[PDB]
Design a protein around this ligand. Structure first.
Ligand SMILES: [Fe+3]
Ligand SMILES: [Fe+3]
Lengths: 322, 491, 83
C-alpha cells in the first residue's frame, strides 16, 4: 500500500505544516496539465485555441506559476470576514449620514459636480469588474486566479456603493437626473472619454499577462487616483463628508489589489526577460492612462494640480515594483 | 436610514453601454459571449428572479461558514469517520475526488458569464456565482483534508482531476463540455439550468439527508450549507432560455437542453445511482435511485420545460425506461473494476439487499442477479481471482463510461457504433451517439482511455501499465467496501 | 493481431478483446469466453458459441478466419449460444 500523508501529496516536504490558504487554493487548475489539449475534448475547439493562444503562449513566462502566493493569503472565509466588517462600516456611514440629512446640506455646484464626476463611475467600475473577471478565467495558476477572484467582487462592491448612493442622490435632487444620465455622461462627456478608451481597449487584451498589466498595473491605478484619491479629496474640502469617506474606504480594496500585483510582478522578475516584457506592455498602455487622467482631472476644480499628483502617484505604484 | 432594495437594485445592473473605441464584436466575441445575433437591447430584457446585493452576500455567507466550520471543529476530535459504515466512508471519497476541483473549475465557467454575458443581470449574478463556486471548491478541500493521515485515498480530493483515472476523465469530459468550452449563454443553460437546477440542487438535498441518517453531521452540515447557495446562481440559465425562445432561437435552446440533460443524466447514473441502491446500508433507504428520479428530478424537468415554451427531449421515453437499468450497469462495472477507482465500492447484494433490489426493480434477480450469482458462487468457492478483471471494458466515446445494459435472462446490451472519417466510435445509447453527430468537430479527435490503450499510449500495455497510467497504486486502488463480509450469508 | 469488442451473451458489459488475424470464429468465441463465462456468465455446454457482427446481425460460420471477416479494428461482436 501507499502510506497516509500529513498534507496533500503536492505539499509534502515543506519544513512547515501548510496553512489553510495553501491547503484550499493551490495547484487547482487542471487545464494546465495537458497544454497541447487543455480541455478533455477535441483539441481544435475555439476554447482549446483561446487558451493556448492567450494562456500558454503568453510572453510572460515562469516554470512554476503554481508557486505564487497571495501575500494577503485570502480565502473565501477570510474575504467575507474582512468585507462584512468593512461593509458594516460603510453601511453604517450611509445609515447615519442620511439620518443627519448630510445630502440636503450639499451645495448646488457640488451636486452638479457629483452628477458629472461621481455617479457615471458605475460604468467604469462595472468595466474593471469585467476586466478582473477576465483575468480570473485566463490566468495560469489557481492562486493567481483567486486574487482576480476577490478583486472582481471588490469592483462589484464599488459598483454597488455607487448604485445605492446614486439613488439616494436622486431622492434628494429629483431634477439633476441622477440615475437617468450616467450612460450619456459616460458615452459623450469629454471628461470621461480618456478612461473609456483606456478600458474599452484594455478589455480586449486577451493575453493573460497583457490583461494583467493593462487592468491591474496601468488602468486600475489611473482610475484609483483619479476617482478615489482626487474626487474624494475634492469631496472632503467641498463639504461632502460621505464621499470623502467612501472613497478612502474603497482605496482599502485598491491597496490590497496592489499588494498582490506587486507580488506577482516580483515573481515574474525571477525569470530573465520578464521585466522587459512587462516594461513593454506598460509603455503601450501608459499613454492611454495619461489621456484618461488628463481628460478627467482637468475638468475638475483645481485641474492641473489634480492631473499632476494622479499621474505620479499612479506611476509610483509601478515604480515601487521594479 | 437605509434605502429599500427594490428602490435602487436596477441601477446595479444598468451597466451596458454602447462601445466606441473597440467594436461590439470585439468587446463581446461570439465564441465567448454567444449572443446569437440577439441585440444588446433585447438581452437587457433579462431578469433574474432572485436578487442579492454585495453586502447581503458577504454577511449572509460569512454566517454560512461560521456555522459549518464551527460544526466541523466541534466533532473533529470525535472522529466519526473511523466508525462509519464503509459504504459511507467510500461515498465521501468518491464525492470529494469527483466534485472538489470541478466546483472550483465552475468559478471560471461563472467568470465566463461574468465577462462575456450581454445581460448585465447575468454578469452580476455570475459574479456572485463565481464567488459561490470559489467557496464550494475551497470548503470541499478543507473538509477532507482533515482525513489525510487516515488514508491515501483522501488525498484524491485534490489529486483525482489531475489524473487519467477513467472516472476522472469521465468527469472532466462532462464539465469541460458543459461549462469550460461553451459561450456565455450556452453555459448559462447547460450548466446552471440543466445540471445545477435540474440535478444537483435535489441531489444535494438527498445527499444531505443520507449524511445525517448515516450519523455523519459534519458532512450533513457541509453539503446542506453549499446547497443553500445553488439557487442564487442556478437560476441564471432560466432567463437566457426565455430570451432565446422569444427571439428567433427555440431550436438552439432546445438542442443544448437535450445535450446537457443526457450528459448530466449519464454522469449521474454512475455517480449517484450506484450509491443510492448499493452503498446506502439497506435500512437507511427511503426510496430507490429510480423513485428519487421520478419524484424529484423528472417531474420538475417537464415543469420547467413546459413553462419555458420548450418540449421534452426526443429521448425522454427511453430515458424513462433506463432508470430501471443504467445504474445497475455502472454499479456492476465499478465493483468489478474496483481496483481501477480511488474508493472501495460496496457490492450491495446480500440476501436482504437482493429482495430490496427485487421489489424496487422487478426483474432484477432475473437479469442483474445472474452475474452477481456467478460472482457470489466464485468467492463462496475460493476463486476470488475471477472477481477481478483481465481486460478493459469498451468505453463510450461521449460520456467516457463503460457500455453496459440488461444481462441474464433479458440480455439487451447494445453498442451504438458510428464510423466517421475512418475511425470507429462506440456509444452506449442512441443519445450518446446523437450528442456526437450533431457536433462532431467538438469531439472527433478526442481519445478515450481504451483508444489511448489501443494506440500505443499506455506502456507497459497491460493492466498494470494502465493502473499506472491512471496514477493508481495499492493503497488507493479500490477493493470491496465491506471486505467480502457479505459473502458469509452464502457460506 | 487485432482488437475487437466482445458483446458476450447475458454478460452486462461490452469488453475489449484481442484476437489474432489467424483465428476462427470458434477460437474468437473462446478468447471472449475467457472474459465472461464463469466470471459473470454460467457455462452452457448443452450449447454452441457463435460469433455474429454486432452492427447488422450477420452470423459468421464457426470455421471462418478473422482475416476474411472484413472487421474494422475494434468492431463490436455478438458472442452467442446456439448449435
Ligand atoms: Fe457549487
Ligand atoms: Fe453551483
Amino acid at each position: 500500500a501507499l502510506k497516509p500523508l500529513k498534507t496533500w501529496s503536492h505539499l509534502a516536504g515543506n519544513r512547515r505544516r501548510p496553512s489553510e490558504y495553501e491547503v484550499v487554493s493551490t495547484n487547482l487548475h487542471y487545464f494546465t496539465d495537458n497544454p497541447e489539449r487543455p480541455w478533455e475534448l477535441d483539441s481544435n475547439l475555439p476554447m482549446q485555441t483561446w487558451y493556448k493562444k492567450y494562456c500558454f503562449d503568453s510572453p510572460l513566462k515562469h516554470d512554476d506559476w503554481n508557486a505564487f502566493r497571495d501575500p494577503d493569503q485570502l480565502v473565501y472565509r477570510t474575504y467575507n470576514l474582512l468585507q462584512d466588517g468593512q461593509e458594516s462600516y460603510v453601511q453604517g456611514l450611509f445609515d447615519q449620514l442620511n439620518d443627519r440629512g448630510h445630502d440636503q446640506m450639499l451645495t448646488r455646484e457640488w451636486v452638479e459636480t457629483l452628477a458629472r464626476f461621481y455617479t457615471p463611475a458605475r460604468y467604469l467600475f462595472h468595466a474593471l469588474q469585467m476586466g478582473s473577471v477576465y483575468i480570473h478565467q485566463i490566468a495560469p495558476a489557481s492562486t493567481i486566479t483567486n486574487c482576480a477572484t476577490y478583486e472582481t467582487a471588490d469592483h462589484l462592491r464599488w459598483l454597488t456603493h455607487t448604485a445605492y448612493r446614486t439613488r439616494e442622490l436622486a431622492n434628494c435632487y429629483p431634477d439633476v437626473g441622477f440615475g437617468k444620465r450616467e450612460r450619456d455622461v459616460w458615452e459623450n462627456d469629454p471628461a470621461w472619454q480618456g478612461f473609456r478608451e483606456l478600458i474599452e481597449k484594455a478589455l480586449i487584451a486577451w493575453d493573460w499577462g497583457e490583461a494583467f498589466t493593462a487592468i491591474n498595473l496601468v488602468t486600475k491605478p489611473a482610475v484609483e487616483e483619479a476617482l478615489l484619491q482626487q474626487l474624494g479629496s475634492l469631496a472632503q474640502s467641498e463639504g461632502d463628508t460621505l464621499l470623502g469617506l467612501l472613497a478612502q474606504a474603497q482605496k482599502r480594496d485598491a491597496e490590497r489589489h496592489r499588494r498582490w500585483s506587486s507580488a506577482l510582478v516580483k515573481m515574474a522578475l525571477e525569470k530573465e526577460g520578464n521585466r522587459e516584457v512587462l516594461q513593454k506592455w506598460v509603455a503601450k498602455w501608459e499613454p492611454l492612462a495619461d489621456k484618461a487622467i488628463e481628460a478627467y482631472c482637468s475638468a475638475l476644480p483645481d485641474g492641473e494640480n489634480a492631473i499632476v499628483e494622479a499621474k505620479s502617484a499612479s506611476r509610483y505604484v509601478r515604480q515601487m515594483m521594479g | 436610514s437605509m434605502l429599500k432594495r427594490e428602490d435602487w437594485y436596477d441601477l446595479t445592473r444598468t451597466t451596458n453601454w454602447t462601445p466606441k473605441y473597440v467594436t461590439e464584436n470585439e468587446l463581446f466575441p461570439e465564441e465567448m459571449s454567444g449572443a446569437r445575433g440577439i441585440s444588446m437591447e433585447a438581452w437587457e430584457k433579462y431578469d433574474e428572479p432572485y436578487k442579492i446585493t454585495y453586502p447581503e452576500y458577504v454577511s449572509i455567507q460569512r454566517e454560512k461558514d461560521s456555522g459549518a466550520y464551527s460544526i466541523k471543529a466541534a466533532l473533529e476530535r470525535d472522529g466519526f469517520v473511523d466508525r462509519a459504515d464503509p459504504g459511507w466512508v467510500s461515498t465521501m471519497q468518491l464525492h470529494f475526488g469527483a466534485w472538489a476541483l470541478e466546483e472550483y473549475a465552475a468559478s471560471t465557467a461563472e467568470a465566463r458569464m461574468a465577462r462575456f454575458a450581454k445581460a448585465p443581470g447575468n454578469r452580476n449574478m455570475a459574479t456572485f456565482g463565481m464567488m459561490d463556486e470559489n467557496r464550494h471548491g475551497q470548503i470541499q478541500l478543507y473538509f477532507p483534508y482533515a482525513n489525510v493521515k487516515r488514508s491515501r485515498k483522501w488525498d484524491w480530493a485534490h489529486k483525482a482531476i489531475h489524473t487519467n483515472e477513467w472516472a476522472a476523465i469521465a468527469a472532466r469530459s462532462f464539465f469541460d463540455d458543459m461549462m469550460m468550452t461553451r459561450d456565455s449563454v450556452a453555459v448559462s443553460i447547460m450548466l446552471t439550468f440543466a445540471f445545477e437546477t435540474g440535478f444537483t440542487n435535489m441531489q444535494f438535498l438527498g445527499l444531505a439527508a443520507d449524511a445525517a441518517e448515516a450519523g455523519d453531521h459534519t458532512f450533513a452540515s457541509l453539503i446542506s450549507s453549499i446547497q443553500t447557495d445553488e439557487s442564487r446562481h442556478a437560476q441564471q440559465g432560466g432567463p437566457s432560455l426565455k430570451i432565446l425562445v422569444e427571439n428567433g432561437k427555440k431550436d438552439e435552446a432546445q438542442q443544448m437542453v437535450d445535450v446537457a440533460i443526457w450528459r448530466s443524466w449519464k454522469l449521474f447514473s454512475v455517480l449517484t445511482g450506484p450509491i443510492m441502491d448499493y452503498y446506502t446500508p439497506l435500512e437507511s433507504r427511503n426510496q430507490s435511485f429510480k423513485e428519487f428520479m421520478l419524484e424529484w428530478i423528472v417531474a420538475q424537468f417537464e415543469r420547467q420545460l413546459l413553462d419555458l415554451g420548450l418540449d421534452k427531449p426526443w429521448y425522454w421515453d427511453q430515458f424513462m425506461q433506463d432508470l430501471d437499468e443504467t445504474h445497475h450497469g455502472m454499479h456492476l462495472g465499478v465493483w468489478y473494476w474496483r481496483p481501477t477507482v480511488w474508493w472501495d465500492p460496496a457490492a450491495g447484494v446480500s440476501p436482504e439487499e437482493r429482495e430490496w433490489l427485487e421489489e424496487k426493480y422487478p426483474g432484477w434477480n432475473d437479469t442483474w442477479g445472474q452475474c452477481w450469482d456467478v460472482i457470489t458462487d466464485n468467492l463462496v468457492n475460493g476463486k476470488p481471482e475471477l472477481t477481478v478483471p483481465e481486460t478493459l471494458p469498451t468505453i463510450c466515446n461521449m460520456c467516457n463510461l463503460p457500455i453496459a445494459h440488461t444481462p441474464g435472462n433479458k440480455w439487451n446490451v447494445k453498442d451504438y457504433q458510428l464510423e466517421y472519417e475512418g475511425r470507429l466510435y462506440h456509444f452506449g445509447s442512441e443519445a450518446d451517439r446523437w450528442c456526437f453527430q450533431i457536433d462532431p468537430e467538438r469531439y472527433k479527435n478526442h481519445t478515450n482511455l481504451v483508444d489511448r490503450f489501443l494506440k500505443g499510449e499506455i506502456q507497459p500495455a497491460d493492466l498494470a501499465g494502465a493502473l499506472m497510467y491512471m496514477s493508481l497504486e495499492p493503497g488507493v486502488m479500490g477493493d470491496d467496501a465491506h471486505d467480502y463480509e457479505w459473502v458469509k450469508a452464502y457460506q | 493481431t487485432f482488437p475487437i469488442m466482445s458483446n458476450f451473451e447475458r454478460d452486462f458489459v461490452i469488453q475489449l478483446v484481442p484476437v489474432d488475424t489467424e483465428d476462427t470464429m470458434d477460437q474468437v468465441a473462446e478468447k471472449c469466453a475467457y472474459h465472461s463465462i464463469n466470471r459473470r456468465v454460467h457455462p452452457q455446454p448443452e450449447k454452441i458459441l457463435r460469433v455474429r457482427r454486432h452492427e447488422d446481425g450477420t452470423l459468421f460460420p464457426r470455421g471462418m478466419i478473422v482475416s476474411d471477416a472484413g472487421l474494422r479494428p475494434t468492431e463490436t461482436l455478438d458472442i452467442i449460444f446456439m448449435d
